[PDB]
From a paper:
Ferritin represents a ubiquitous class of nanocage-like proteins that are primarily involved in maintaining iron homeostasis. Accordingly, ferritin plays a central role in taking up iron (as Fe2+) and storing it in a stable and unreactive form (as Fe3+-oxide/hydroxide). The crystal structure revealed that TgFer presented a typically 4–3–2 symmetry in a cage-like, spherical shell composed of 24 identical subunits, featuring highly conserved organization in both the ferroxidase center and the 3-fold channel.
After incubation with Fe2+ ions, the site containing the Cu2+ ion was not replaced with an Fe2+ ion, and this was confirmed based on the anomalous difference Fourier map. Similar to the crystal structure of TgFer + Cu, two Cu2+ ions with occupancies of 90% in TgFer + CuFe are bound to the 3-fold channel based on the anomalous difference electron density map. One copper ion (Cu-2) on the outer surface of the ferritin shell had six coordinated waters with the Cu–Wat distance of 2.52 ± 0.20 Å, and the intermetallic distance Cu-2–Cu-3 in the sites is 4.25 ± 0.34 Å. The other copper ion (Cu-3) positioned deeper inside the 3-fold symmetry channel is coordinated by the OD1 from Asp129 residue (distance of 2.68 ± 0.02 Å) and the OE2 from Glu132 residue (distance of 2.78 ± 0.04 Å). In TgFer + CuFe, two Cu2+ ions were tightly coordinated with the Asp129 and Glu132 residues of the 3-fold pore, similar to the structure of TgFer + Cu, and the Cu-Cu distance was approximately 4.5 Å and 3.9 Å, respectively. The results revealed that copper could be able to compete with iron for uptake in TgFer + CuFe, likely due to the preferential binding of the Cu2+ ion with His residue (imidazole nitrogen) over the iron ion. Similarly, significant differences in the iron contents were observed between TgFer + Fe and TgFer + CuFe proteins, which were measured at 2,637 ± 2.46 and 240 ± 0.97 atoms per cage, respectively. In this work, the crystal structures of TgFer + Cu and TgFer + CuFe had been solved by X-ray diffraction analysis at 2.3 and 3.9 Å resolution, respectively. Obviously, a low-resolution diffraction data not only present a challenge to structure determination, but also hamper interpretation of mechanistic details.
Author numbering:
A (entry chain B), B (entry chain C), C (entry chain B), D (entry chain C): 3 to 170
Write the structure that this text describes.
Amino acid sequence: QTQPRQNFHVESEAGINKQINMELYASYVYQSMYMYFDRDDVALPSFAKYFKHNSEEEREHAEKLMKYQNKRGGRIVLQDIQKPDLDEWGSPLEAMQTTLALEKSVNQALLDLHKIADKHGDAQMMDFLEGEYLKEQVDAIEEISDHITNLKRVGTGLGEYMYDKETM
Amino acid sequence: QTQPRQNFHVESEAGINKQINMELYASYVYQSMYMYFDRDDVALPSFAKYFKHNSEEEREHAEKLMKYQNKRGGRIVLQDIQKPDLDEWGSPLEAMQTTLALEKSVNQALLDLHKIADKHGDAQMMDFLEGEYLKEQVDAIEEISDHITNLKRVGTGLGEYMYDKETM
Amino acid sequence: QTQPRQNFHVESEAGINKQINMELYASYVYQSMYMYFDRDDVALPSFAKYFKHNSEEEREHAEKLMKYQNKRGGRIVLQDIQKPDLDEWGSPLEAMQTTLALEKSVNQALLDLHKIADKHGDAQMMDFLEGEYLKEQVDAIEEISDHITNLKRVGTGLGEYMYDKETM
Amino acid sequence: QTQPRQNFHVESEAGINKQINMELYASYVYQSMYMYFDRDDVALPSFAKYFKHNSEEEREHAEKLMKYQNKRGGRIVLQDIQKPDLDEWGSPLEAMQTTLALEKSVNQALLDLHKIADKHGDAQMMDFLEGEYLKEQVDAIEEISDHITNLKRVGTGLGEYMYDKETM
Ligand SMILES: [Cu+2]
Ligand SMILES: [Cu+2]
Ligand SMILES: [Cu+2]
Ligand SMILES: [Cu+2]
């Protein structure tokens, strides 16, 4: 029943919970990369600054999702945040590639939550996602594919250094 | 056959009219409560200030729909504005409670109008509704449910006066 | 071997990892409380703001710990972040009591990491903990016990409201 | 028997003297490298600027110890300052590498002096060392190991010149 509940189906509420946890996994994985470039044997501190921002950015998307969950009458059920697969992510190009599939995975999750809110006619929730998440995911997915092509252009060695200084 | 008509079904035109009339009823009902907390034997000026705001909200929310009705080529068919059910709304709780079901009633009327734009392929009218009405309704519906909870906590007496001073 | 390693024992490195994960659990639990007071049926938004800060504050202690782990030659091994015990923490007094045992638990963990660095004569690590963590824990433990005594003084109802407005 | 002597064992006094002499050797060695990157056939002015800084760091680090030796009632027994092993330090890498082991050598000499304050119950002299020397040494030792990694990445040639311009 709750108090502000209207047009908010039970499947949608459990999807926001399932999505809240994945957005936290993204924040975790990005922090794992942050401190892979603060590692002294890599020492790319502007790459590290990138993932520190991106980790905080995703933690703010989870918060924006939980803040929405409370605004619609649902209740927040948190689950364990699983550790990232790797603890050492290789070259910058390799790590940026990992990020692409990550945000590409996080995107399709959002795209399927939108499909659920459509199933039970949740027009507002559809707008909230397509305005505050889908619009941002396509931005992040391009800017990551932008960094992928450049890191391939500059190559290794001096290329990995000069891309940290000038672009990041 | 009006100059700017495109993709605008007469069913959607009629819905905006019936919806304009309802958004005005909410202005009247909130104004009824405005001048209730200014009663000499109610004397809650900040609750009065809250409904003076909210009454002007709905009035400008109806003006936006009217401005949209002309923007799409429909014609504004006005109707009578019914007097509110009550002439006195009891405790601040029982007033806020009447407000919740009011916005909750208006939210469905907006949602059903959104279903009418979807029935006739009006992609624009969908975004206008879910962007400048449904988005606001969800926030307000929470905001009211936040006041109901706190009023139940502070209880009758000094708790009612304090909520007026510190929150409103 | 690594590159900057000196006087940094294997037990200490695994303790920083084990402590990094617990500091994240603290950040998680605090966020769970943050959104328990953004819940519309509780709606204490200055209590919620407290745990939003405290959750971010602990996430910055983990970062300060990982930043230290990289500065001393150790490597960061992350583990799963377990979900908080409860998803609804009861009255404010009850939640603040939970927090006390939390920071009291997180303290003794730090106190025992200090004992490990002492075992293998890690004078710097001892200073880093007793300057940047132990000094802050005793501050946080008092300010939480301060909030515990007051919430007992003001009681329930109007007391729980007026403490959110004036002090938080 | 000096005026401000308390808790200050002659073993600690002797250690500060031998440590003062070493902190000056690091000033000389860094100055040796300063005027090496100003050689007409090295011509790396930013690497020169780095060692002009670091040479003045150790000189002021010895002055702090001297100021502390007088602060505790000990007397400053100066000794000769040995010339550095080399008169030319090769590539920027092989120079930075010589610097790592230099600070790593100085860090142990500080740590062993800290063990001398602990052997004779000098709680203050412990905090002065671990507060204004050991804390800095850990940071510098990382900072050097960060430069070694990046120089190995950028490689000889244009990579050496670019690191001079963009990082130093
Ligand atoms: Cu995201
Ligand atoms: Cu409205
Ligand atoms: Cu902490
Ligand atoms: Cu020094």
